[model samples]
Target: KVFGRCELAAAMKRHGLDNYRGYSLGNWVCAAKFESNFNTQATNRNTDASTDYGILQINSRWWCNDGRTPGSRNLCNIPCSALLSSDITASVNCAKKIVSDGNGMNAWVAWRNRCKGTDVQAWIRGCRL
Candidate 1:
């Protein structure tokens, strides 16, 4: 609910995602678009009621907890709803941590299945840095 592609890119860059951890900004942008359409408040529930959260669609199985989901790794140590907020500080930091864990963008299904080997650069096309 907070950003279009270009705005999201700028915000991301400002959040220390400007090529953080060796992944291109475009990779994150492309994955964000495909995963949640850049919606900060996005949430997608799996068959087991576990959910993917925020612009990155981070999974509760490892990244967050919704309180109802037991046995979560909760690596980010934030509520699932926290990622759904407009202020992306926690979400960005959490994503960066995920990447630092060596999974890279491969942890995000959208990146692996959709953005990889595609024209990811277009996600930030024509917008100011």
Candidate 2:
């Protein structure tokens, strides 16, 4: 599913992503926009042979088990395929776990390059969440 910007904002807020671990909803929204463009089925293969999956681009190397990543920790304890679902609940839960585990939002390079150290309120300005 390709979520509209506001739709994704509301969804992330529903899943407790708003200000989770000191990152705002706008931060998550901005990261998602840059990472996957709000596409649930998005996937990107890393040069190291790992793949990033779903809306937040959760990586197979540590957060998910793809059954092919060389040294998967599967810390989220779910198949990487689960992240590609349109439901997005699995992706959201895993993302929360990623931040809660002390990795923070920097787990996503997209966040670092795009959303970090920026006033992201504009990303969610009209979302009202």
Candidate 3:
């Protein structure tokens, strides 16, 4: 659900961008909105192993670092409950960095297809979303 995007942003906001690896909050939300309709539970099985679950659409491998627990399938807007009191922000920020930096959202056909260079907050308004 697109609901995840705003909630994710709120979560990201809680985390802040001090740990930004490469991408910006603006870009992260934009790409996420375009890619998964902001649905944290979003999953893609388009014959591409890389395109898989959550608000960030992290793949199975992303679980190694991004996943909250040792072995869990529930990712995407990973259950906010899993967020720890001290490192909730750090954890969310880490996830954003890994995907935005490591894989580069721009290269993804989905991102490029919807790349409009708009801020995520503005996007929330423009699309009447």
Which candidate achieves the best TM-score against the true structure? 2
Residue-by-residue lDDT tens digits, candidate 2, 1-129: 999999999988988889988888989999999999999999999999999999999999999999899988999999999999989899999998998876688888999998899999999897666
Model 2 misplacement above 4 A:
none
Cα lDDT tens digits for candidate 1, 1-129: 758789999999999897898878899899888889889999888987789999999889888988877578899999899999898888899999898988788988889999989987888889899
After superposing candidate 3, which stretches have Cα over 4 Å from the reference?
1-7, 17-19, 48-51, 61-94, 100-103, 116-121, 124-129
lDDT for every model? 0.88, 0.92, 0.50
lDDT of 2: 0.92
Cα RMSD (Å) per model?
Answer: 1.1, 1.0, 7.0
Query: By descending TM-score, how would the candidates be arranged?
Result: 2, 1, 3
Candidate 1 error regions (>4 Å): none
Candidate 3, residue 112: lDDT: 59
Q: Provide TM-scores for the models.
A: 0.94, 0.95, 0.52
Score candidate 3 by TM-score against the native: 0.52
Per-residue alpha-carbon lDDT of candidate 3 for residues 47-71, written as tens digits (9 for 90 to 100):
4333355554545433423333334
